[PDB]
Design a protein around this ligand. Structure first.
Ligand code: BCL
Ligand code: BCL
Ligand code: BCL
Ligand code: BCL
Ligand code: BCL
Ligand code: BCL
Ligand code: BCL
Ligand code: BCL
Ligand code: BCL
Ligand SMILES: [Mg+2]
Lengths: 359, 359, 359
């Protein structure tokens, strides 16, 4: 037996200053996942449609479905979201969660204010492609859940009794919130979750059955690698959504290994690089930092290939690890310095791999 | 030179709902330990006897002996311990420490209260084999040490003067307490040690010589992987100790490598799995998480084998990584997906490897 | 393609209880750095001269020059520094920073008080070569920067407005201060940076242009591996600087790999070991702990050799990983247990490799 990682990644780019792209991925490794419960199979579906361009609103949906050991899980969430200002963004929404025989629903309203610690022009003009951006991000959340199970009233009253009876509740809550190795992953990425504030508890804010209502804030700090904070605008290109976008991702896994597929189509794949050039967006760092926590437990060979198809007439002007071949606007990366880049990022490395291209 | 890990693990299971088992292990790797002082040789002996079944009391002993670089160390501790309630457990005890020419003794009384943050029945019934359990655990400690060296009065007065003269003492103490990489290992496992409280300092609580007396509390939180908090009941099967149990473990190590042997016999090895099945208990996560911090520094081949001997007539119904062979109730795991599991766990992975069996 | 690490390290030792030595290193690996911006090329120059032996003063200089992606960076700092007491040390100094079209200058005065949490004699006498030393270190800093750009007045007023307007400023500042993975590296090494105090803000403390003036303190704790705290005296051998010392180090790097050279000459290389023996100083732990965070992302072979040249007549009495050869006072380590030690330390291991020698 030998442990090999087989992957194929594909990127097909829309033309113009359309930043749109199709992304496809297939991956196979015969190594165990680091889930203490297995088998672990999961499918995710994300869609997003322009709702009101002019007020900036987008309607986004997410369906998470999985089976763990044997337990069937489901979570959906659909929400309306828009930029109010450069740092203030707002949301109203709804969803449901389910695990085996249990389900509940929920609705919410939420604001999020993203603040960079500094905004120097001596930085702006001297660093062409900046990466690290330190900042802190402020969530303000109104959420409601119908209390229609009796598990829900039990957890409600357990919590209501926990608050007010403890006082280190907005501190210790993080122990519960960031379950398992999620806790550890906070510091791995230079991420800090502040203590919460509870600004109220209401019963019953909804005429149907009893409804449990939470008014709470938290804050999260990042030292620079946290894409949520560092890449606040970019990660939400409402402005480029001229039509509905979508991604389907899935994995199957067990003691024998991991299989994953990805298919999607969405803006943000390429960005203006300055100077008539464009690039594939900078690799977000959290995916690589957090997968790093699992990627080092078995030695593997890399059988990996990337294909990039540029729009018609476009040429690559520069590529970090260089490509192996080209055939009109199709470029392919395989072995050599690219296989070493793939080994590197799978294990936690964030070494830059850059592709700039122009007509 | 090539770096190989040679190991053999053996598990012989007592019948019935006896959860008792014999555990044996031998391990060899020709890679250096990550101790900044070497050679590093250590032997540990643990025993435990039923003292008063009816009041739940157990008498447990531990002897740690080591030699580091050249320094001879010894620590023993024997204590009486029992479950008072489901979360409150109590202890009274004594021991000694020694390093070269230095020794001191000590006696103690201690309570520990283990609290889960939540207890939902929607979880209980829908997840057959749950792993992550978030909680917090409260130590309340009366300890006494005879001040019979003058190193002991020096450390006493140094400490007495440190307290009261500092005020961030119950915070900074963690810097001293979790020496070296032990500090780091706290966050690795989703573990938090809260600040201490000091509830008094007494002289001299003992008629013989002067006696230094500390009344202090601390708290520790875990996000789910902390077996101490997550597996509170299980890790202390007083109820299954119908006779004295024991474990002898040892390692020899240096710049040339690591050798380890383990022999023991104790309850808790198998558990009822529900449905007439039993399993080997879930792998505790802290051993794997903390050994992970050292297991990634040299590449190695795996020459590893597990033998499980079931009681007479019992069959394995399921095994994660499957076994290679069987001969009556002896099952053996070697190479393939098992060697990959062993590589994985030695390096920090916690991928589930499950064995369920029944008559 | 195969990934190999090629290195050569050389140590030439001055005789007597001169602790002086020449250190040379060359390293090559064809693996990518974990910098999200590449190419990344950097040169560093450190010098140090006795200024006033009798008052213990040393004059030290540092020049950091780099190019990242395409951005040209420079930082120099020269300072006068001396031991006042065993734990209090003082500094006065100056420098400049520059990035592209931007530069500023600065002058400073600073004290640093290094405190060990404990000083037991039962430790001192029983552990011949102690490593872990827990402690905390207190910086007290007066710094001034001419406000001669308008980027500098902009950052000044932005900061002045940030202080006083926020209140969790001396907490959140760490998010900004420890940019990127630097934050994470704090906990990796058992290192804690406390909140700051701001003891004043002054304008304009300098007759020329406007001058921004900061009076601030911070504290840092280490659990034992932090060489700054654990090896406070040793890391600053002012007493052994009978002449000017120096080190030139440099690396070139990109998607293709990493190249590094080092040349220097300075005291502190060997230490009295007790018993007529001397050793190469204990490996500092932070270099190895922090490089560990990058060293595990690509598999590699080791083609490494260490040469040690002892002074004339000196013999090695003991070496951890043993040497392969000797020719008069030249000793060479290659392959076997040494290549495994090199793999180990490059990946984060701190396993002791010891060399003791005497006449
Ligand atoms: C995830 C890392 C950050 C974070 C990320 C930020 C960011 C960034 C945003 C929010 C915003 C939201 N966050 Mg938040 N926030 C986090 C912590 C949480 C927690 C929690 C209990 O821990 C809560 C309650 C909230 C909830 C809030 C809401 C008030 C708000 C809208 C959520 C939503 O519409 O769902 C989203 C629906 C999903 C479940 C999809 C999630 C999948 C994401 C993570 C992956 C994106 C896929 C991308 C790579 C592919 C795009 C293609 C698709 C076709 C679109 N956040 C952590 C600390 N938060 C949004 C906002 O500003 O609204 C005001 C927003 O832009
Ligand atoms: C280790 C991880 C947790 C923790 C684990 C918990 C748990 C769980 C328990 C205690 C309990 C105790 N803890 Mg505690 N507690 C920790 C921190 C410490 C520290 C410290 C200075 O940091 C202190 C003072 C205390 C001390 C206290 C005592 C008041 C009490 C009884 C100790 C004892 O009898 O020794 C024990 C004797 C030894 C030295 C043996 C230790 C070896 C252990 C760790 C390995 C078990 C071996 C097992 C795999 C094999 C079993 C076979 C044998 C034949 C039995 N804990 C950390 C944070 N603590 C017990 C209690 O509740 O009493 C009231 C208890 O069940
Ligand atoms: C680096 C890890 C520690 C730390 C290390 C300690 C130690 C130890 C010392 C100081 C001291 C100083 N620290 Mg400090 N301190 C740190 C955080 C910082 C920060 C910050 C903004 O984070 C600040 C403002 C300060 C600044 C201060 C100054 C007040 C003071 C003198 C600095 C100096 O002359 O530069 C130094 C010039 C350079 C830029 C060179 C730096 C390169 C170093 C790190 C490598 C040494 C090379 C060695 C291996 C080779 C020697 C050969 C040469 C020929 C000499 N420290 C962190 C937490 N600090 C000194 C003091 O006590 O003065 C009162 C001192 O001895
Ligand atoms: C509340 C969640 C936020 C969200 C938070 C984030 C965060 C965080 C990130 C992005 C990132 C991206 N987002 Mg966004 N962003 C939002 C939704 C917007 C909308 C929109 C108009 O609604 C669009 C089109 C996009 C699209 C963009 C892309 C520019 C970028 C993905 C680059 C890529 O090649 O992915 C490649 C596609 C894949 C390889 C993965 C596809 C797999 C699917 C399943 C994603 C699942 C994520 C998984 C880890 C689950 C986390 C969910 C939680 C558990 C709930 N975002 C919503 C509002 N987005 C990433 C980025 O690079 O930004 C700089 C990034 O880190
Ligand atoms: C105060 C310490 C606690 C203790 C705390 C813990 C903790 C924590 C754990 C256990 C675990 C176990 N404990 Mg207990 N538990 C206590 C004592 C009880 C008693 C008893 C009746 O006295 C018994 C019989 C057991 C036995 C049980 C087993 C169910 C389980 C081991 C499974 C195994 O296959 O190990 C296999 C045997 C080995 C592979 C190792 C044998 C090696 C010896 C030397 C153990 C040394 C540990 C080492 C890391 C040193 C730490 C000591 C500190 C530095 C002081 N415990 C005492 C009261 N126990 C583990 C578990 O899986 O629980 C879910 C676990 O994490
Ligand atoms: C303010 C900074 C401090 C400094 C802080 C430290 C720290 C911290 C350490 C040392 C270490 C050393 N210091 Mg000192 N020390 C100071 C300056 C003194 C002076 C002096 C008389 O001025 C001298 C001669 C020395 C020399 C000594 C040596 C005993 C020892 C290096 C052993 C070695 O073989 O290196 C081998 C040489 C190399 C392999 C590396 C040479 C490369 C150059 C470029 C160093 C760059 C470091 C790099 C990581 C950049 C960090 C700088 C910041 C970003 C600003 N120090 C100043 C006052 N020094 C190390 C040690 O082992 O101590 C126990 C150590 O960890
Ligand atoms: C809000 C999210 C969590 C949770 C938050 C945590 C936190 C945080 C704390 C508690 C605390 C406690 N939790 Mg709760 N609490 C919840 C679940 C409930 C439920 C339930 C029926 O689901 C129960 C029985 C309890 C049980 C309790 C009390 C015994 C205790 C006060 N909580 C939900 C699922 N719980 C408090 C405690 O004392 O901690 C140990 C405390 O600080
Ligand atoms: C209680 C466990 C630790 C320890 C706890 C720590 C802690 C925590 C602190 C001190 C602090 C100090 N420690 Mg102490 N203190 C101990 C050891 C003593 C001994 C000794 C003779 O063993 C001495 C000389 C001192 C020395 C001192 C003072 C200089 C200082 C006040 N402590 C023991 C071994 N020490 C205080 C300080 O100022 O920290 C730097 C402080 O907060
Ligand atoms: C002192 C070192 C940092 C920095 C420290 C941080 C910290 C810490 C905080 C801010 C905070 C803020 N920073 Mg600032 N602040 C600096 C840079 C400045 C500059 C500038 C023109 O360079 C600007 C526009 C601002 C912008 C601001 C305000 C919007 C906000 C109050 N700061 C420098 C570079 N900034 C505060 C805030 O609200 O955080 C989000 C805050 O706590
Ligand atoms: Mg880590």
């Amino acid at each position: 037996d030998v442990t090999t990682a087989h992957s194929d990644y594909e990127i097909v780019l829309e033309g113009g200053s359309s930043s749109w792209g199709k992304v496809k991925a297939r991956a196979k490794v015969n190594a165990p996942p680091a889930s203490p419960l297995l088998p672990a199979d999961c499918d995710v579906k994300l869609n997003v449609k322009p709702l009101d361009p002019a007020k900036g609103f987008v309607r986004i949906s997410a369906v998470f479905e999985s089976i763990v050991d044997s337990t069937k899980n489901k979570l959906t969430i659909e929400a309306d979201i828009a930029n109010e200002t450069k740092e203030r963004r707002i949301s109203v929404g709804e969803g449901m969660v389910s695990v085996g025989d249990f389900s509940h629903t929920f609705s919410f309203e939420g604001s999020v204010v993203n603040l960079f610690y500094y905004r120097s022009d001596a930085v702006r003009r001297n660093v062409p492609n900046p990466i690290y951006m330190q900042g802190r991000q402020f969530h303000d959340i109104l959420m409601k859940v119908p209390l229609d199970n009796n598990d829900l009233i039990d957890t409600w009253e357990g919590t209501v009794k926990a608050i007010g009876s403890t006082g280190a509740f907005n501190d210790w809550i993080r122990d519960f919130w960031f379950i398992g190795p999620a806790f550890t992953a906070l510091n791995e990425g230079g991420q800090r979750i502040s203590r919460i504030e509870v600004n109220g508890l209401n019963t019953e804010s909804g005429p149907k059955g009893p409804v449990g209502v939470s008014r709470w804030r938290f804050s999260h700090g990042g030292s620079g690698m946290v894409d949520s904070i560092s890449r606040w605008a970019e990660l939400f290109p409402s402005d480029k959504l001229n039509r509905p976008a979508q991604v389907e991702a899935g994995f199957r896994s067990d003691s024998q290994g991991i299989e994953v597929k990805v298919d999607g189509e969405f803006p943000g794949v390429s960005v203006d690089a300055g100077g008539g050039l464009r690039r594939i967006l900078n690799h977000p760092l959290i995916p690589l930092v957090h997968h790093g926590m699992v990627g080092k437990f078995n030695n593997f060979n890399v059988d990996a290939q990337l294909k990039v198809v540029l729009p018609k007439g476009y040429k690559i002007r520069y590529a970090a690890p260089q490509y192996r071949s080209q055939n009109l606007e199709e470029y392919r990366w395989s072995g050599g310095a690219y296989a070493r880049w793939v080994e590197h990022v799978c294990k936690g490395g964030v070494g830059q791999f850059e592709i700039l291209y122009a007509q």
